[PDB]
Amino acid sequence: TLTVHVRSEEWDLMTFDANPYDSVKKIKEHVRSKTKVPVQDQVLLLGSKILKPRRSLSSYGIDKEKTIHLTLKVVELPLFLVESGDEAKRHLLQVRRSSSVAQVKAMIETKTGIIPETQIVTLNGKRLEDGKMMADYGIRKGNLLFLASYSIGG
Amino acid sequence: GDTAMQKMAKSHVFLSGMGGLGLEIAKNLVLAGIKAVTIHDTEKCQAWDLGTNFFLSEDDVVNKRNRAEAVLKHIAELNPYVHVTSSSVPFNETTDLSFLDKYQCVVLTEMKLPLQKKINDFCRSQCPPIKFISADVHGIWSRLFCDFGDEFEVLDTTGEEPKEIFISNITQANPGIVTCLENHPHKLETGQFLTFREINGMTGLNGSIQQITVISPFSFSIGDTTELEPYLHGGIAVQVKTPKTVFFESLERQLKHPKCLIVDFSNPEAPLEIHTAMLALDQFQEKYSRKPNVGCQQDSEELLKLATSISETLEEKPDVNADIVHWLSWTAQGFLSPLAAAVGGVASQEVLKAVTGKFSPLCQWLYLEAADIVESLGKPECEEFLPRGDRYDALRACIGDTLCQKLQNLNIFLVGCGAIGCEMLKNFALLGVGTSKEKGMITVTDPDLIEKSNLNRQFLFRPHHIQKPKSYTAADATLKINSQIKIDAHLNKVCPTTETIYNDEFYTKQDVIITALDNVEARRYVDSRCLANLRPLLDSGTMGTKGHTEVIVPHLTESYNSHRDPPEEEIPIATLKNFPNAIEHTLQWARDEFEGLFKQPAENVNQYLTDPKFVERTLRLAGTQPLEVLEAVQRSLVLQRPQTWADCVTWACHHWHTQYSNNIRQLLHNFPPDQLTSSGAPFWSGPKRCPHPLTFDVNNPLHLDYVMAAANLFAQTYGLTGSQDRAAVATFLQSVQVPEFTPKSGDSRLEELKATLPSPDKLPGFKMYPIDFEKDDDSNFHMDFIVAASNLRAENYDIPSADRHKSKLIAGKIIPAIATTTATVSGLVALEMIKVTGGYPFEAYKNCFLNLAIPIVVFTETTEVRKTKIRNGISFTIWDRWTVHGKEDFTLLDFINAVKEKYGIEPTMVVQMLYVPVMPGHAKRLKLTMHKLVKPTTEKKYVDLTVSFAPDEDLPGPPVRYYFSHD
């Protein structure tokens, strides 16, 4: 267990429980509960080093520290995504961060002719599922959406 | 040209370094059919190698034989048509590389990076270039490299056979539109190339290759046709295969600027970080002539320094990942056999791609990892990972003794001993699954036997094993890999009939279940069984280059039944009905007929008798075809109802005459053989075939086989007995007389049908029994009917006949397994199995869909549990089941109240229909006592029932299990 401190130019100091193994994204989620809300605003930094969201605190060499401190900072809503086919058949689709997951699956239906109910897609290594938003999954320009069909044999 | 298989038969391969990884590659390549595989190693066997190498033996380690030369006999047995040659030639900077010129491809394992560079430079220099593949596995981390030369030509990217299309019309213009037959569509790309042959009119286009652009679907422009003569009829186009060139860079050039494929897009920059660490390990070995010792802070720091220095020399700068380096330093001395099997499969396929060009190759690097297996251990003790001298030391150095002990005590249930199952058993044995005598027990079951195969032959099975049980043979072969392993081999198929054999006790005693099946129905039956007993399930599939892995954990994921299935591509309606061209058409038409004869009619009639509103529902449905259903019901109820088995036999003879003679003759009346289409071209041309009707013969066995199967099946639908006497049916068939056929050139009745139809009350105790298709049970006649129905239809359309075994395989659309994919899938499934036995979190488990043809490997975290809630209620997962204990005297009302009192939700109705509010006498059903309401007839301790709660319509609920006695 750990305690993490967040320093911000225009916001109050934030102190909360944490774990070194846990991701920087988890810290940003922890920040959201205490103040400011959501992680899209957050761009955490330590010293001169940029802190990537997926990487863990331990990935940056944090060790033998009861408490650690970081300097938070704040910095294209429509983006282009390429959707890979079942057999080497890429497609071009435009999405926005604020898009319902069903809307995006409907785009796949027009492109591939596959009913969205039974569509199976994988985005940033997370199964694409109903009742979600593209923002929840976490989407950046140039990402790829993969269509898959289940295999039987052996 | 020469085929991909022919190219392998001419090509030689050189493999160096025979650890677990070098063997896994050699195994797959020799099974594939490589002409020559030259194995080479320099070190002699050691007790550590027994954990990594599944052919090495305790005898070989004592005699200190060369690693290669000890395993050469066992490898050569795999595929006797391949010449496997051993080599002990020392490999140094001194050693001349001129002896490698003969080999088409060179695969390097367990070799220094400097020496690997020198070889790579030599290989890519030669003309033609020798292909280079480096793969190593250190601990839980792997590396794979491909360098086929500055320019590499891929002759076949899709790996499919070239398509054939039929042309309806070609306009004479530049952009002259070419439109295919409305029946036969084409799926072509805007860049593709076609070669046209046997065109009428445009004789010039017969020997020409034209690029086509699909600016409008189902049409394209071939070029300028104004000069050429006008098109009349015909025109078959064949897809031209176009090579795809992919360029490679040397090993030295790629280390500085690596090009890696991304396996898991969640961590897009992860491969480059691994590249930095793996490259640091190589420098650490160079600087200090050893691998980093486990748990040594100095070694872990020094590696991080090197990785930090390397990160500066890299092009894009990356940020070092401390977690990766730390885990690399710990496991560097260990070897993870399942990761090796996975890397071995992929690497193998790349070799074939190099000698054949059958698929697009890997672009330079591929790093695979088992980090998810160690991350959940947190920061564990170094003493756990120290070697105890045994065979499992290599595994221990990767996962620690704690997790090794959990594997040793496991109780796994392997469903299916196919290619995946056989690989799984080898992966189990190296891992030490179920090797502890006190607790561990692997249970494997498959009902099938071994086949000659000759091609796509399996590594556990051999010729003298032909026609001997699969499971028994594998189990006996597996013990030779690991003596301490405990396996209970069974010949029972996992289905409802054996549910007694594999009872709820069995599933609860089993710690994990793994499936190696080829049909979805069995997958659903196993998934359902595991949900009831709250145990995990590991599924996998192989379809040529493509494979898939699905991990299902209790209360952490969804099930296989939840995951829904897309419809397979439909054979054009009308092409199946009137224009079959292949045995695939007749086989599918017979299955379409089987359900349309022995299943669907029976359900329609049983639905008419049960539902008084059936008459309204059918009137509403699909206008202009309520008449068809209504007349089909009145036919089965009255006109065609058999009271005797002889009536069933006559119905089969009359039906044979309508499908294979009368229906044919009327199609010929409509479309006579001489008839020509618009543009003076024969109608029975190309895809369309002119049929010839058949005449019934008792002596002909196909004719008899159809009647014998149809009547015994027809009797089942009505509840009658069958005789199965061929001579009796033969003699009787001579006596029956069949109505003569007359071909034909071409709502008041619908009201008459309503009257004529017998009202359900009038027909008491009459029920029909639908039949569900089962390929497996040959005494059913279910398959016997299909084989006859297809072969007889083939006779009419001059299609070649289809044997029993051939037809079965065609119907299953089963694809022969390939050693590369299976070995890969089996390694990945094994890796996930380690996480399960540890009880790891949801985040660790990662499914995988892969395709080696592309190549692309997709890792995705498993599908989360989806909880379903009804208004003003508590949400319940799929895994949850609701249990109610009762007294011997109870009512359905006293139950319904007890449901709301425990959970807070009250059911509107209850299904097993036992009680509906709409049903008449609902107050009678509600007063009924429980033992009278439901009669198990075995005085069972409990009974399982469904439940539904309506907030609009009724909404399902979790299954409910009631105990007659509190006890």
Author numbering:
A (entry chain C): 7 to 81, 87 to 165
B (entry chain A): 52 to 797, 823 to 988, 992 to 1030, 1035 to 1050
Task: Reproduce, without paraphrasing, sentences from the article in which this PDB structure was first reported.
The covalent modification of target proteins with ubiquitin or ubiquitin-like modifiers is initiated by E1 activating enzymes, which typically transfer a single modifier onto cognate conjugating enzymes. UBA6 is an unusual E1 since it activates two highly distinct modifiers, ubiquitin and FAT10. In the presence of Mg-ATP, E1 catalyzes the acyl-adenylation of ubiquitin, initially forming a ubiquitin-AMP adduct.
Since extensive initial crystallization attempts with wild-type UBA6 did not result in well diffracting crystals, a chimeric protein, referred to as UBA6chim, was utilized. In this protein the SCCH domain (residue 623 to 889) of UBA6 was replaced with its counterpart (residue 631 to 889) from human UBA1, resulting in a protein with enhanced stability. The overall structure of the UBA6chim-FAT10 C0 complex revealed that FAT10 covers the AAD, IAD and 3HB domains of UBA6chim and engages in numerous interactions distributed over a smaller and a larger interface involving the NTD and CTD, respectively. Second, the C-terminal tail of FAT10 is threaded underneath the crossover loop towards the ATP binding site with the C-terminal G165 being in close proximity to where the α-phosphate resides in the UBA6-ATP complex.
